[PDB]
Amino acid sequence: EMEKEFEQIDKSGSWAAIYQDIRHEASDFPCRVAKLPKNKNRNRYRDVSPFDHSRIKLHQEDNDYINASLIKMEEAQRSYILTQGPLPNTCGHFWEMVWEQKSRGVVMLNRVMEKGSLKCAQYWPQKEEKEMIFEDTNLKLTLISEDIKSYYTVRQLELENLTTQETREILHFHYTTWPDFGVPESPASFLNFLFKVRESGSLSPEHGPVVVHCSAGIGRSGTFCLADTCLLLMDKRKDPSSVDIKKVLLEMRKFRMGLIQTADQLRFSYLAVIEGAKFIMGDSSVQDQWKELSHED
Ligand SMILES: O=C(O)COc1c(C(=O)O)sc2ncccc12
Incomplete structure (x- = not known):
């Protein structure tokens, strides 16, 4: 369960270790098309490429x-x-x-x-x-x-x-x-x-997929999508305990490399999901609280 795991990781201060474990287990698929000479100028970063299977x-x-x-x-x-x-x-x-x-x-x-x-x-x-x-x-x-x-x-x-x-x-x-x-x-x-x-x-x-991008399209972008997917999963089942955040991230990484780029972005993903769960399980008023705390005006 995410909230218990979160406290367990904070207490041992092992976010770096947890994050590296995900990096180790992450999928590795070919990016042959991305690496073709004719596409060199279509790529912003040498080390960030789409997998052929999901491009x-x-x-x-x-x-x-x-x-x-x-x-x-x-x-x-x-x-x-x-x-x-x-x-x-x-x-x-x-x-x-x-x-x-x-x-x-x-x-x-x-x-x-x-x-x-x-x-x-x-x-x-x-x-x-x-x-x-x-x-x-x-x-x-x-x-x-x-x-x-x-x-x-x-x-x-x-x-x-x-x-x-x-x-x-x-x-x-x-x-x-x-x-x-x-x-x-x-x-x-x-x-x-x-x-x-x-x-x-x-x-x-009813729409085609939302387009999400930062610079490389993996760090901040991965964080956004991970939080959203975890909340949706939880929402479908109305069951926060059913969601395994690390498992979800690893599934996402089957489709694009490097999603979530630091241990603190992973830790933040937990925070966002844990807090968002309040809304999912039907405390609507929390949305107003976020709006206020965000200082958007
Ligand atoms: O989105 C992020 O947090 C990190 O994204 C990246 C960069 C940036 O935003 O300058 S530069 C870079 N190089 C390799 C992999 C990711 C990123």
């Missing part, structure tokens, strides 16, 4: 490669697409993927610049009147509105397939205060943000 394929004959993985959680019945922060030459591919996979929501957990470096291209328009056209993939993207909070921004975007003139509303959930290789400020601010994504309907099975 998202672009619907194009030229080159179908993007650094993105489908995390298909069978038992939970929810899917996520985890991807790197798009590069200056892959923003058209990124939006092509969003279109083709029928995603309603995009979750961004990093800033464009972190620690003096550019961890992600400016892939969405910052101003209504300055829309973006991705010539390579024939897509248009317009900022419709934004709602800026203290530590996260929600944007409404219109994505248009210029080939067919069909348009879709994409919701962009941008968490601005989560450091690379770090953790959110509190379980509350993380949970407040996750529930915003949930409340939008972006995670509905």
Whole structure:
């Protein structure tokens, strides 16, 4: 049981050891396509690649490669697409993927610049009147509105397939205060943000999978998805004790390498799930508490 295990790990101070155990047991599958010479410039990090078996394929004959993985959680019945922060030459591919996979929501957990470096291209328009056209993939993207909070921004975007003139509303959930290789400020601010994504309907099975990305698409992204899946599993069964967080993470790691990047991100995942469970088991008022504690205004 997660809460007992949590206290047991804290007491012995063995988070590093627990985390390394997961790293040792984690799946290892080929990433041949990712490592092809022609794809070198499509990858942000040399050591972060999608497995061939779970990679998202672009619907194009030229080159179908993007650094993105489908995390298909069978038992939970929810899917996520985890991807790197798009590069200056892959923003058209990124939006092509969003279109083709029928995603309603995009979750961004990093800033464009972190620690003096550019961890992600400016892939969405910052101003209504300055829309973006991705010539390579024939897509248009317009900022419709934004709602800026203290530590996260929600944007409404219109994505248009210029080939067919069909348009879709994409919701962009941008968490601005989560450091690379770090953790959110509190379980509350993380949970407040996750529930915003949930409340939008972006995670509905009636949609294609939500797109989740930080810089590499494994650390912060893995943490977000792990917490969400654990809460959903618990919710389906209405049974917090049925959820084995480490087992869930190992299942996720069958679909993308390196999910959760530090022992403290793992420890934070426990905190978030333990706290989120209060809502699941029907203390609705806790949502209000998170909103307040998060200081979003
Ligand atoms: O998302 C995270 O916490 C860590 O993600 C990564 C990086 C970053 O955000 O600068 S750089 C990097 N290199 C290899 C694997 C993950 C990451």
